[PDB]
A = this chain, B = another copy of it.
Amino acid sequence: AVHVIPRPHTDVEKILGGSGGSEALGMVETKGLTAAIEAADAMVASANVMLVGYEKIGSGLVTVIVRGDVGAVKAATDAGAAAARNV
């Protein structure tokens, strides 16, 4: 699952940490920490986005979160997901 949530409410974003009114959040759900880190690295390499965190939701699933302006987040989440395939 790759997802861009546009215009989230501050409370919604703050609880994930990074209290801001970000124009968008991008999420790449990965399997295992290797895919997670490679995804994150690919993400900050590809666009002007900030890493918000890795959410370990159990069962080896790590969902990587970035924040930033819309266009950057769209581009970053695609890069992050592609990088996850490649590990």
Q: Which residue of B lies closest to A24 (CB)?
A: B6
- With both chains docked as a complex, state the minimum distance between the C-beta of A44 and any C-beta of chain B, in angstroms: 5
Contact across chains for A15 and B54 when beta carbons are under 8 A apart: yes
Identical chains in the assembly: 24
Given A6-B24, A44-B9, A1:B59 Cβ within 8 A: no
Question: What is the interface of chain A mostly: helix, strand, loop, or mixed?
Answer: mixed
A46-87 residues with Cβ-Cβ distance < 8 A to B are 46, 50-51, 53-63, 65, 70-71, 74-75, 77-79, 81-83, 85-87
Most buried by B among A8, A27, A50, A79: A8
Per CB-CB distance, the 6 closest pairs between chain A and chain B, nearest first, are A6-B6, A58-B58, A2-B86, A3-B34, A7-B70, A11-B51
